[PDB]
Amino acid sequence: QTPKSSRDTIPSDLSSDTFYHVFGGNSNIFESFVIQNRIMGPCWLDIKGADFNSIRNASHCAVEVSVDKPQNITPTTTKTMPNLRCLSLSIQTLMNPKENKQEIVSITLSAYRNISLDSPIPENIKPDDLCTLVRPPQSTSFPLGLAALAKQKLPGRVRLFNNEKAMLSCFCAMLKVEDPDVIIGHRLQNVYLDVLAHRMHDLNIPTFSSIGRRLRRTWPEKFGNMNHFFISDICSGRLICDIANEMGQSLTPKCQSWDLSEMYQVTCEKEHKPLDIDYQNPQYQNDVNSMTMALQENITNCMISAEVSYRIQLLTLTKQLTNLAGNAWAQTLGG
């Protein structure tokens, strides 16, 4: 932070008659903070001189503090960690031929609010909450009897919405109120987070920032390869635990295609027959049973993703690797 020309860095080949090289001109701020204070991955931090009255309405977090100098923060030797609020996302899409736009029809959210990495996670943990939001893929109305049949067949809550926009508004509000620490899913990183972020952009969702932990009222100007940096910056605060990314693939060499069903079979020795859900089909606008089966497939995909995430020990292995390398946990998970 400098009063003027804060965005201008010193080139290494700066002309001078007393020196002929400069190191560290283009240092990243996180790298400087981590190097100087000897921070090694996620750990407890002792913070002195925290200002509890400086920050107003800047995050989705419960406590907001600040410090005037980085030397006030020192890492501690405590090995234990708090329980992590994990949230599993399963995204069902619809391919629009007109504009060639990928549209979201439903989300299933599975909540695990006491996931402790200090102790082994048990097999087939059940979520503390399970909810599914849906919108009609074709019309503005659903087939009749959907609510009662969903109550009678589907586990967890099911919420019906007239259109996509209110559906993502409810998704964002639920994300804010849940406040999860880790977002769990399959191929989220380069497919479904993209789809989700750009659908929040297209429908002008005002609370879109809740997918991370920072409060922004407007999108970056250049939103519209930089897309990856923008989404990763927006999601900051909630670790993305993707079981089919490079990190998840490196922990499951025994798969071949890393499809959700294949991962389920390989890691948990259980069989799930995948249904090829195509919401372009006209039957999903008047056949309630087909819609209920599709929602059930979304829900089971969500819990399968969560269970495979817990079984392959993705969080603990990535954490340990981060403490060993000294980088950020998110970089280990998604890099």
Partner 1 sequence: RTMRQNLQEASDVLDDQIESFTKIIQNHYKLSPNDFADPTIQSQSEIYAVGRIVPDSPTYDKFLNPESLSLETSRMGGVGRRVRLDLSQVNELSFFLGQIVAFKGKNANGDYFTVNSILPLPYPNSPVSTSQELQEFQANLEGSSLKVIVTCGPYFANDNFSLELLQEFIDSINNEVKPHVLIMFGPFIDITHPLIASGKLPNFPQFKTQPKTLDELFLKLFTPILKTISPHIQTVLIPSTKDAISNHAAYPQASLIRKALQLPKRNFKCMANPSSFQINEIYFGCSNVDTFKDLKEVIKGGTTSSRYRLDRVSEHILQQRRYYPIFPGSIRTHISGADLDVSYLGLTEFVGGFSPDIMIIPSELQHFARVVQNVVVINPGRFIRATGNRGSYAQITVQCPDLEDGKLTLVEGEEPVYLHNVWKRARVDLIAS
The piece of 99-107, 124-132, 154-162, 260-268 that touches partner 1 (CB under 8 A) is 99-107
Binding residue (CB under 8 A) for partner 1 from 82, 224, 282, 326: 224
According to the binding rule CB under 8 A, does residue 249 interact with partner 1? no
Binding residue (CB under 8 A) for partner 1 from 10, 61, 65, 226: 226
Encode 48-79 in three state secondary structure: CCCECCCCCCCECCCCCCECCCHHHEEECCCC
Q: Which is nearer to partner 1, 93 or 108 (CB)?
A: 93
Q: Which is nearer to partner 1, 191 or 293 (CB)?
A: 191
Task: Check the chain for breaks (C–N over 2.5 Å) and list the residue before each, or none.
Answer: 224
- What is the rounded distance in angstroms from the CA atom of residue 185 to the CA atom of residue 18? 55
The piece of 43-51, 96-104, 108-116, 250-258 that touches partner 1 (CB under 8 A) is 96-104
Binding residue (CB under 8 A) for partner 1 from 95, 144, 173, 324: 95
Q: Which is nearer to partner 1, 191 or 266 (CB)?
A: 191
Encode 144-186 in three state secondary structure: CCHHHHHHHHCCCEEEECCCHHHHHHHHHHHHHHHCCCEEEEC
Binding residue (CB under 8 A) for partner 1 from 16, 80, 225, 256: 225
Q: Which is nearer to partner 1, 225 or 257 (CB)?
A: 225
The least distance separating partner 1 from the CB of residue 168, rounded to whole angstroms, comes to 15
Closest CA to 134 of 152, 109, 160: 160
Buried b (16+ CB within 10 A) or exposed e, 13-34: eeeeeeeeeeeeeeeeeeeeeb
According to the binding rule CB under 8 A, does residue 102 interact with partner 1? yes
Q: What is the pairing mode between strands 73-75 and 45-47? A: antiparallel
| Token reading at 286 | 């008047």
Per CB under 8 A, contacts with partner 1 among 177-216 are 190-191, 194-195, 198
Binding site for partner 1 (CB under 8 A): 93, 95, 100-102, 190-191, 194-195, 198, 224-227
